[PDB]
Structure formats: C-alpha cells, structure tokens
Design an enzyme around this catalytic site. Structure first.
Site, PDB file in Angstrom:
ATOM      1  N   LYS A  61     -10.863   6.465  -5.543  1.00 45.67           N
ATOM      2  CA  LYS A  61     -10.457   5.222  -5.256  1.00 45.67           C
ATOM      3  C   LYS A  61      -9.120   4.619  -5.757  1.00 45.67           C
ATOM      4  O   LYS A  61      -8.987   3.899  -6.798  1.00 45.67           O
ATOM      5  CB  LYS A  61     -11.634   4.238  -5.549  1.00 45.67           C
ATOM      6  CG  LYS A  61     -12.937   4.435  -4.824  1.00 45.67           C
ATOM      7  CD  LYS A  61     -13.953   3.402  -5.001  1.00 45.67           C
ATOM      8  CE  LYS A  61     -13.719   2.004  -4.100  1.00 45.67           C
ATOM      9  NZ  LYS A  61     -14.917   1.104  -4.230  1.00 45.67           N
ATOM     10  N   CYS A  62      -8.087   5.609  -5.950  1.00 46.81           N
ATOM     11  CA  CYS A  62      -6.916   5.371  -6.548  1.00 46.81           C
ATOM     12  C   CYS A  62      -5.606   5.492  -5.225  1.00 46.81           C
ATOM     13  O   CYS A  62      -6.045   5.965  -4.319  1.00 46.81           O
ATOM     14  CB  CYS A  62      -6.731   6.599  -7.515  1.00 46.81           C
ATOM     15  SG  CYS A  62      -5.111   6.560  -8.466  1.00 46.81           S
ATOM     16  N   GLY A  63      -4.550   4.680  -5.676  1.00 46.13           N
ATOM     17  CA  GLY A  63      -3.642   4.587  -4.605  1.00 46.13           C
ATOM     18  C   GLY A  63      -2.925   6.067  -4.095  1.00 46.13           C
ATOM     19  O   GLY A  63      -2.457   6.025  -3.312  1.00 46.13           O
TER      20      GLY A  63
END
Ligand SMILES: [Li+]
Length: 163
Positions: free
Chosen positions: A36-38
C-alpha cells in the site's frame, strides 16, 4: 560473528522456513516490500521484469514484507501473496512479514545493515530499500527506497559475471 547471508533462516510466505544456504552461489537482491505504497506498482513490475531477464543467469530476488513504514503492509501473508501474484505475476521469492528496524528486526536485516551503511543514518528509511549480495553471500551495495530496480541492473551484471 555472522559472516554471510547463508547463516540466516527465514519463514517464506507460505509459512515454510528456509535457510538462506539455498542462495549459495547466486547474486541476491533483497528488498523490503509493502502493498500500500505509491511506489508499490513500479517496484513490483520492475522486479518481476528483472527476475524474468536474469533468473537464468543467477539472480535471485528476495522480497520481505514489512509493516514498519506508514502501516503500508497491514495484510497477512495469504492476502499479500494473492495480491502480488495476481496483480504482478511475481515469480521471485516471497517471504513472511518481518521487522527491518529496531531490536526485533530479523537477524538477516541486522546483518545487512551491519555491512552496508545507509545515507547519513543507518535504519531502513522506507519500503523498498534494496541490498545487493554477491555470489559469496556478502552484502556489497545498498540502495535507497526511491532507487528504481532497473537502475540496479548494471551492478547486478557485474556481480553475475564474477565466479
Ligand atoms: Li544511526
């Protein structure tokens, strides 16, 4: 006294413990990951491409989920595995979730950080840092989170060429 990555044992994403003796003689790229990281997409896409290009030449990519950075790996192992396999077709080696910083960090990461210093300070700074390990199990380079996996390929080729 640890002298190489081969001394450590880790639980894989299926719950199967494996000694890193498995990786003797192969160049390894060890990456702490999060779903859940860009930069999740770009890191996983490039890692899967590099696996496909270089696994036959001796590269092994090892991905360690870690929830220490912004709560960006909250899921359990089965869900992480399904996510990355279905979205990216990951064929490289996935592990169970660990810590990379603090006194409860996995011994593998205590070792990696003891061999290659970060920029300014030594703790892992975010998801998707990378350590490059030679065919003798020695961590010889460390790359910060924002380093595209593709930008590590030249260094990998040098180490693959060595005996
Ligand atoms: Li420090």
């Amino acid at each position: 006294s640890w002298n190489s990555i081969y001394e450590f044992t880790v639980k894989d994403i299926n719950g199967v413990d494996v000694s890193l003796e498995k990786y003797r003689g192969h160049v390894c790229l060890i990456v702490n990951v999060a779903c859940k990281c860009g930069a999740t997409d770009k890191n996983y896409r490039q890692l899967q491409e590099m696996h496909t290009r270089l696994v036959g030449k001796g590269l092994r990519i090892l991905a360690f989920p870690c929830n220490q950075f912004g709560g960006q790996e909250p899921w359990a192992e089965a869900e992480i595995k399904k996510f990355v396999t279905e979205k990216y077709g990951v064929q490289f080696d996935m592990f169970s979730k660990i810590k990379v910083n603090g006194s409860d960090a996995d011994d593998l990461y205590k070792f990696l950080k003891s061999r290659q210093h970060g920029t300014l300070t030594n703790n892992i700074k975010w998801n998707f840092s990378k350590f490059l390990v030679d065919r003798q199990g020695q961590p010889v380079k460390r790359y910060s989170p924002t380093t595209a996996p593709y930008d590590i390929e030249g260094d990998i080729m040098e180490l693959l060429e060595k005996k």
